[PDB]
């Protein structure tokens, strides 16, 4: 038994001041950092770190650098005092083969420039025909942010062609105002943009613009819908692409020679060579194959026997593994065999949003993976010829990526610089120095230095109740789950507090994580709330067996995991969580589930706040919806997972349901809200509605953000205080 | 002193059932009626009434008729038992001059048909160029619903030309959905559609399509913006138009001869004749001139001296009067003089939304006017040569018009059929029979019969507390005002009840009126509310002196009249109205004022419900906004009357402000709401928002209507019950 904690109520105007003061304070918990890290060897004996940061006193961006004192860093082979390095100030690529050549995308067209002069450009007769920029769905869901690639050895460029002409329109704006250009947005069951690759060949300043032959991909890939990845093979002689089926259940990697481009005539065991375009890997799942950036062509050892070898990723029931994938062709160019050599244990996943760094002098590949723990990223190295494996960072400390399709700032001989974070500590940038041994394959590392940007304030001394990181087993499935509790500012172990249950629950995202992202929720803990995060089946970085349970069953499985996880935490917490005062909140997919949970479990959740909620999957985009819901679109599958069928089950009482939505939200459209609101009207269900006419998917304006917080918080008080 | 009445609270679900049951009952207070009334003399000795009604058992429309037993009616010269007549079943015009000719507007183009065959049509190369249909602003604000006219004597047709190409666009739809054709909507300070008239001349089946010479109007009317009225003059020889300035402060009537049309060359005191187009009347106002349908050309008595004479309306400080307007031209065609002969006392207004019926055999004009009372319409007759005047309907009973630009179903010799209504009684259609006397000019009438449609249920026996119709004088202006109170279902004179104050307050509309339109508010009185209606300065049918006070001052004057009127009623009611529990509601302009009143008088109004509110006049249309706000648009005038400047004054506490709006509202655009919501977000002001994604200006869907009522009522309880 526990005593109900007093819950302190307050005025809306006081919630505004709370949210406003808080934003001033939350920014004081961090320092100016840098948005990119890279290392270069300017000289054989010097290593220089570069990063992008603001100029002190302003928000203007510039490139900063520091010299790494390698003679001194090399001596930090023990856990000695760490050195500080101070960094100082002072869409386009330069071809590695030629420093005078640049290529970039300007106004969604590809340009090639020499010494400041444009020598070649692509053109289109329509805004819906694009070059150098990935198709919207590809950039948005399949996470490719570039359409431009250079060969390393030679002055040749590869780029993407996009055709949006049959893509369905979406209007944005405010009713009664003048029309603006429509957005092109694919929907489930609708046609997507058409894609193909092209090349520009530069011969002594003479550009040629040559398309790929149209059936080169299709002929080998009968199910082809998307190009998910592309780039040059070694020595710049060949182009590979990774392609997928519409539902992303099938994936193939195919290697395309120069002769399979539509060149002008002026430019053109018994194992064989790359006779023509061929698949060098194929994979199929029962549910889906996820995209990743762990693709890297290896240099061929034998030109007579140009064994096809690359670093790739294979999905497994458990984890997502790096593998050395290799293949043999017949004399006639088709594959006779693939090997699928795993470089790691299946029990953990790689970070698919990260690229990899591959050595050739030594056969070492460096990558980010969940080696130590499901909630933590580590930097690891493996030898791709042996399968020998080691972890280069400490367990309990998480590697942080600042961007999708991120990179490690790794110097193959000396070490690397990166951000590391943990649940009890803000991200910090540190340098790990390599140590090499005789008669050994893998390096070891030592933490030798920190990097800070000069001219800025140092790190604040922060004081808080560290989040309780909890692992527990499901009582229904036997699966391990992770959850986290953020403690209220003034905590009494023998009192119970109102529950704020934050959910996302959708695929591709992990909420419970070993980082410092939980800081933003201190604002609720200062109001006497317990904030609980739980992951679930369908959640990212566990493996397909864990994710697959939501296949054609969205809103049916992950909602139960959230409910059971909450109840188990209530037992483990010693009963300081009050189950009679529970409010559930989420955004995007989380808004969808906040609706699902109150509709299905009105006796657990007193109220729900659903922001950016997806009411109908048929109104959402193609690549996301169909990999989970299947294809061809099935009316009864999509109907079962919609909110439409749950409107009847929504609470009859007022102040139990709140809907929050942007008017300009291009991700989850306002149409989803209007559908939900219209159903509520028909069914006689009460709802509170908050709209932000000038906001997108999230709320970015500082005052709009304050307002939103004040209303979520005010609403929550009324929901519980009864 | 008075005892607070218990206020009975209830659940949202109970408010839904109340509103739902009510709609079933409110329809039971009425019967099937008919949407048009007309009389014809099929034979010299027979008068036949025709009307449009549904076929019993269904909603299918058809034409019904009854023969009037004239001899029986003629003998009903006393207040005898009245007779019932039972009516039985069984965009285009037929030319009065020729029964074989028809003309109509189809798909917004003008067609002329003979014996079922099209002989002539207009055409356009764009959807924005229209013929036969009044321009949107003209149809919407200046109340003209037709662009097609026939000559009475001859086979000639007149029609309107509309050019919308420079009119600003307005997008409607749901964000994320495909674009639909933009609406053309003028805004204050923006360009309107261009208009001109054209003719089709039919000579033995040979059509000619002839434009008006472009400067015919402009040359005589330098301020010309709109054509507000048009039609043929007597004998079909000439065309007159009524035109206005952009701010509608100036108005002219000009008479245009056949020779001022471009024509094919084959067709084209010392007082004179219609030498050419000339103004025959001009009027100017310091504020504005209102439009009306009281224009009628009179037959000229002397062809040698074709005195220009017509029935017209002159605005006065008090009232809107019929006048016989006449003019003389010089020999050279320009006016030397106008007479302005008033046919009525200035103390009352004509019904400007009604047309008039004019006799020539006797110089009698029949019209609807506020002869007996400011809240009541009467049918009146006057002799246009003498000014002799009489009232043909009983005082205390109001004439009802079923439509804008309505007509009297008047037979000049026998009498008329019309709907009459009163505050204590549902509209009924009755026949008034004329009585003529020797050596007398005006007819008298007797109420002889009622007309009902056969096959339908008779009138219900209704029981209610009749509305208290109140007149009182302002303590600040000395002006007379009218107000009405609807009593709560179970009324205790010594108890006080919560106040529901309904407002419109805008120009062109009268809320307090002697009719049965108050029935819809019984639904609030059954919940224990007192419903109070008050008119104000700026309100319709009093005269320009009464209306002009809101000139360039919208939201500044009419709000005070509503506040003072409420307080005076509280005194006159004996204190049964509770001033500590006041909720104000209105729609459209009323929504605007509901915001104005709480922002300005938070100590009187506990809460406001603003539906369809206009937050910014610059977002509203040209013809309406500029006649009140002036032209050229002034930033500080429009700023002063906007809600933007009042957002700061809106209540800080929650549940005090509610905003209701349609998403597809083409009258008051959603942009008005998004502007208001955005300001609230910036200022930190709480609001409740209800949106109807599939509704227009009002809410028409039966379930959407039930839902809206339930939320307005639920909200009101929470606002007062504290």
Numbering used by the authors:
A (entry chain B), B (entry chain A): 34 to 123, 257 to 434, 465 to 918
List passages from the publication reporting this PDB structure.
To examine the substrate specificity of a second DPP-IV family exopeptidase, we selected C. elegans DPF-3, a DPP8/9-orthologue that promotes male fertility through N-terminal processing of two large RNA-binding proteins, WAGO-1 and WAGO-3. The overall structure follows the conserved dipeptidyl peptidase (DPP) fold that is characterized by two domains, a C-terminal hydrolase with α/β fold, and an N-terminal β-propeller domain encompassing eight blades as observed in other DPPIVs. We validate the specificity of the motifs through applying qPISA to another member of the DPP-IV family, C. elegans DPF-3, an orthologue of human DPP8/9, which reveals a related but distinct cleavage motif. Through a DPF-3 structure that we solve using cryogenic electron microscopy (cryo-EM), we can rationalize differences in the subsite interactions between the two exopeptidases.
To relate the observed differences in substrate specificities of DPF-3 and DPP4 to structure, we determined the structure of DPF-3 to an effective resolution of 2.6 Å by single particle cryogenic Electron Microscopy (cryo-EM). The map was interpretable for residues 37–123, 259–431, and 470–916. DPF-3 superposes with the apo structures of its orthologues DPP8 and DPP9 with r.m.s.d. A comparison of the DPF-3 apo structure with DPP4 reveals an S1 subsite that is nearly identical for both enzymes, with all amino acids being conserved. Instead, the divergent enzymatic footprints appear best explained by differences in the S2 and S1’ subsites. Unlike DPP4, DPF-3 contains an acidic residue (E309) but lacks a bulged loop inserting a hydrophobic/aromatic residue (F357 in DPP4) into the S2 subsite, which alters its geometry and chemical environment substantially. E309, which structurally aligns with a serine in DPP4 (S209), is adjacent to the double glutamate motif that is required to position the terminal NH3+ group. Another significant difference from DPP4 is the presence of an isoleucine (I705) in the S1’ subsite of DPF-3 that is oriented towards the P1’ substrate position. In DPP4, the corresponding side chain is a serine (S552), which is retracted from the substrate along with a segment of the loop. This difference is consistent with DPF-3’s enhanced preference for several hydrophobic and all aromatic amino acids at P1’, because the isoleucine may facilitate hydrophobic packing of these side chains to contribute to substrate binding or positioning.
